Design an enzyme around this catalytic site. Structure first.
Site, mmCIF file in Angstrom:
data_model
loop_
_atom_site.group_PDB
_atom_site.id
_atom_site.type_symbol
_atom_site.label_atom_id
_atom_site.label_comp_id
_atom_site.label_asym_id
_atom_site.label_seq_id
_atom_site.Cartn_x
_atom_site.Cartn_y
_atom_site.Cartn_z
ATOM 1 N N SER A 199 0.771 -1.228 0.000
ATOM 2 C CA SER A 199 0.000 0.000 0.000
ATOM 3 C C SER A 199 0.816 1.299 0.000
ATOM 4 O O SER A 199 0.221 2.366 -0.108
ATOM 5 C CB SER A 199 -1.154 0.022 0.991
ATOM 6 O OG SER A 199 -2.112 -0.994 0.690
ATOM 7 N N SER A 242 -5.929 2.465 4.012
ATOM 8 C CA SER A 242 -5.359 1.699 2.913
ATOM 9 C C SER A 242 -6.442 0.862 2.223
ATOM 10 O O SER A 242 -6.344 -0.362 2.141
ATOM 11 C CB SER A 242 -4.226 0.816 3.421
ATOM 12 O OG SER A 242 -3.236 0.714 2.429
ATOM 13 N N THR A 299 1.957 3.633 5.220
ATOM 14 C CA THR A 299 2.372 2.265 5.529
ATOM 15 C C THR A 299 2.082 1.316 4.372
ATOM 16 O O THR A 299 1.282 1.626 3.507
ATOM 17 C CB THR A 299 1.651 1.729 6.780
ATOM 18 O OG1 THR A 299 0.245 1.909 6.611
ATOM 19 C CG2 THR A 299 2.108 2.492 8.020
ATOM 20 N N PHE A 314 2.011 -3.276 3.632
ATOM 21 C CA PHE A 314 2.143 -4.613 4.228
ATOM 22 C C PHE A 314 1.716 -5.601 3.149
ATOM 23 O O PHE A 314 0.548 -5.615 2.792
ATOM 24 C CB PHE A 314 1.233 -4.726 5.468
ATOM 25 C CG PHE A 314 1.157 -6.130 6.097
ATOM 26 C CD1 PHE A 314 2.299 -6.918 6.256
ATOM 27 C CD2 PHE A 314 -0.061 -6.611 6.593
ATOM 28 C CE1 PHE A 314 2.224 -8.187 6.853
ATOM 29 C CE2 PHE A 314 -0.151 -7.896 7.212
ATOM 30 C CZ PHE A 314 0.986 -8.676 7.333
ATOM 31 N N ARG A 333 7.007 -1.674 12.271
ATOM 32 C CA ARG A 333 7.267 -0.850 11.084
ATOM 33 C C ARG A 333 7.161 0.638 11.378
ATOM 34 O O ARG A 333 7.699 1.444 10.638
ATOM 35 C CB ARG A 333 6.321 -1.216 9.941
ATOM 36 C CG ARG A 333 4.885 -0.713 10.172
ATOM 37 C CD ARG A 333 3.948 -1.158 9.070
ATOM 38 N NE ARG A 333 2.576 -0.934 9.472
ATOM 39 C CZ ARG A 333 1.517 -1.246 8.729
ATOM 40 N NH1 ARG A 333 1.684 -1.781 7.520
ATOM 41 N NH2 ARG A 333 0.289 -1.003 9.179
#
Lengths: 244, 247
Positions: free
Chosen positions: A47, A95, A186, A188, A230
């Site tokens: 994302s 996201s 972020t 993932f 993260r």
């Protein structure tokens, strides 16, 4: 120029994380990292791809303007937090994959390829399907390339209108304090396996007083419980550097 | 805006602190506003540093402020507050309300252009008497809470007579709180303590983008004691928390 800062490795080993943090004060002229090799290793963006996707959606007119609402059609989406009407900032913050998938479909392969080339975005490889190349296809980008791309965005130097870059920059604000503003995103990819782990990302910049710091973090991840690392590892490093 | 109604039930937040003041809160989708005090909501006060919003837009629109990365360099000369004794970005100057920075911007815009823009913006009584660099601080300029929210709505919608880009720049410079579900854009103002018979005014104005809703707000209060100044944020924050907007 990329220089290795061995003292940051403490935050990785304390957590048993294989990963990399890249931090550049003022510009990409010179960056610091815990790991020179990994700094330029390319991973699936997942994302973090929302950033170029939103710029391209704006530039092509697929996203009408800053006040575009992405309406939920009432149909099941993979996370409940996506099941609602979203603004661009909202879709970015949660996201909302299906929102970005529909943007990408309307952009189409030809224009998507063209803009990723203009942005010098990673290996610029969009194969794997128009609505999933950044999720599971062949697109890869390194932490170094992320900071270069973020600096261009910050300076309005991407091949897009200044208006559209400003729109995405505001949609990317994630922390506001008197002395600073953080813009970040972020990513993932998933957990993969122990032998073939997923990747987790946190990228962005901090506008602190009259200075700016660009950053990109990634890590191997095979267990979702490790996901908060993260943000905490890069945040701890930026804290000890006096930035946030 | 489309309508306004008086809701006397927010008065608890004022009386609890012995504050005379007004909150105006407008929901963009319905174009409907609520206020604790219809009369005060229409009363016009010195904007003090809430004037940084139009001043910034005007500074950008005239080319006085070059772009969003303009640094306002400190000359080394003493300023009224230690806070101000440093180089500042536009957001920095806004967030510390750096009077001398805004004074220089207004001097460079000049009386004719400042008047023109305040007219285009329908900004309060549009009275710039008092000197080009202090009319909003100790001059004749006055604006109501209702006018503040109308002005902020036009800013949010890019409807002011300024480029979209410049309005965008000012909107991000005004960001004061970011959360996953909402973004607050805001500006404080404070005219002074005045006297007991003639108190100063303190403001907090701005808007919250919350999911796909937007809430515009403007708070002001009488103030005769600097120690009361934090109430300019806590009263309206408590109201917006109890409305489920922020918190």
């Amino acid at each position: 120029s990329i220089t290795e800062n061995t003292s940051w490795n403490k935050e990785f080993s304390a957590e048993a994380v294989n990963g990399v943090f890249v931090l550049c004060k003022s510009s990409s002229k010179s960056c610091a990292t815990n790991d020179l090799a990994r700094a330029s290793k390319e991973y699936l963006p997942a994302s973090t791809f929302c950033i170029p996707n939103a710029i391209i959606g704006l530039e092509t007119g697929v996203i009408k303007n800053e006040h575009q609402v992405f309406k939920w059609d009432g149909k099941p989406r993979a996370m409940k937090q996506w099941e609602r009407d979203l603004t661009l900032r909202g879709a970015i913050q949660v996201s909302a994959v299906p929102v970005f998938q529909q943007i990408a479909r309307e952009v189409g392969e030809v224009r998507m390829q063209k803009y990723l080339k203009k942005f010098s975005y990673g290996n610029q490889n969009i194969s794997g399907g128009i609505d999933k190349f950044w999720l599971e296809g062949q697109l890869r980008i390194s932490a170094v390339n992320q900071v270069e791309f973020l600096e261009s965005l910050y300076l309005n130097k991407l091949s897009a209108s200044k208006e559209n870059q400003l729109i995405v920059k505001e949609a990317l604000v994630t922390e506001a304090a008197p002395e600073y503003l953080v813009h970040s995103k972020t990513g993932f990819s998933g957990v993969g396996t122990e032998s073939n782990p997923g990747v987790a990302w946190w990228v962005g910049w901090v506008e602190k007083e009259t200075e700016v710091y660009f950053f990109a973090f990634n890590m191997d991840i095979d267990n979702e419980s490790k996901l908060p690392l993260r943000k905490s590892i890069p945040t701890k490093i930026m804290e000890s550097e006096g930035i946030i």
